[PDB]
Structure 1
């Protein structure tokens, strides 16, 4: 879409890509908050989870299954945290839906 994540999807700027298929992309976060911190994003430009449609359900779930598989591939056998931010209170940094996966350290509570 019209965000930096759109540019990454279109391969116009670099990112360290972990996995790709026909409908999503996983890549390491440029500002990592844990020893392992990556994103899984849909190629479809959904700007934020609050405007996702019902028929996007399987796609959103796909982001989580891809996140699961990438986490295992990156050796996160002790677990991890998945995060989706919505809007200003959620601290959403880019208006393209993205699933964070963080691990490689103890995650704490509250989650921000």
Structure 2
């Protein structure tokens, strides 16, 4: 089973449905099931990296790719006014799914602190 064995791995293999917004050979983007902003989606790599602390130096381009796709999708969805990108790491970060993912939230004004 490619893409790892998490909720996100099942989405990658198309075992469970998702609202796919973009997909390329390296990653996939889909809407969040519990949105915290009018537009709230996730960008995940097809390669299974459990968390950012486990990313290797060679994973550098793939991690930057998730942000370039997040930026392009946010443009497609009409987020002219901006957005906020978030990566949660571990317990204190609020990570509940152990497959690296990037949150892209917009459509409203984001506050500070970021949680």
Could you give the per-residue CA deviations for residues 14-56 of structure 1, whole angstroms, max 9, x where no partner exists? 0100000001000000110000000000000000000100000
Secondary structure, in 3 states, of the residue corresponding to 1:6? helix
CA distance in 2 between partners of 1:85 and 1:23 (Å): 20
In 1, Cα distance between the equivalents of 2:93 and 2:86?
Answer: 10
Q: Tell me the equivalent position of 1:75.
A: 78
In structure 1, list runs of 5 or more residues that go unmatched: none
TM-score calculated relative to the size of structure 1: 0.99
Unpaired runs of 5+ residues, structure 2, are none
TM-score (norm 2): 0.97
Point out 4+ residue stretches in structure 1 off by more than 6 angstroms: none
Distance 2:64 2:47 in 1: 14
What is the CA deviation profile of residues 59-105 of structure 1, one whole-angstrom value per residue up to 9, with x for unaligned ones? 00000000000000000000000000000000012000000000000
Match of 1:60 in 2: 63
